[PDB]
Sensor protein
Amino acid sequence: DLHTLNWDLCLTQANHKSNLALEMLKMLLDSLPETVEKIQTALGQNDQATMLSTIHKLHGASCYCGVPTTQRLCQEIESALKRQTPVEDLEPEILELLDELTKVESAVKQVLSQLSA
Amino acid sequence: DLHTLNWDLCLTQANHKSNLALEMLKMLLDSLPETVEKIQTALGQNDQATMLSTIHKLHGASCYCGVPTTQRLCQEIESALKRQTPVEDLEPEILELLDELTKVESAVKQVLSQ
């Protein structure tokens, strides 16, 4: 599913150096379980600042890991939080994002089982 | 100091694409407090398995982040773990690494401001 993870886009983003690209994917994967927990907790706690900070860092990453749906969802959520829409009103997009991160974790773990030396 | 962080080095490791290199530094910086905690906790617990995976992952990152001292210490620790050198005997190199990572954090925050 290229909407979830697109290796060729990740290659493009990383200037056709499969080296950096796979390393970026490694760094994203290591960071994802903590990101997911922070998002889940901020949603339950209605914690505006924590949600923003963590979405912002994920957004940064997504621009270089060939994850189009993640990138879009982070953009909508971050922009909205920066306008002070409360976390509560973003529940649909945040829930959609969490579901997407589960698919991204699987997709990256698959692309690393396939291509990592 | 350029033995701690060298931006030009990050650029060579990144084939001269700036925004790529910049994002890699952000990913490294964000990972540091937890990685330091993982290294520290594994030292205290003589957890050679967690030490190896954690050092291995930091080492992979350091190779694209122009951080010469960090990279070398990771190589020394990883090599020695792979020869079954006790984690406890690598206390000096581990403490040097924790020391160096504080300096890396300061340096990266500085470069990211520019």
Chain A touches chain B at residues 13-15, 17, 19-20, 23-24, 26-28, 30-31, 34, 57, 60-61, 63-64 (CB under 8 Å). The helical segments of chain A are 7-13, 18-45, 48-62, 68-82, 91-115.
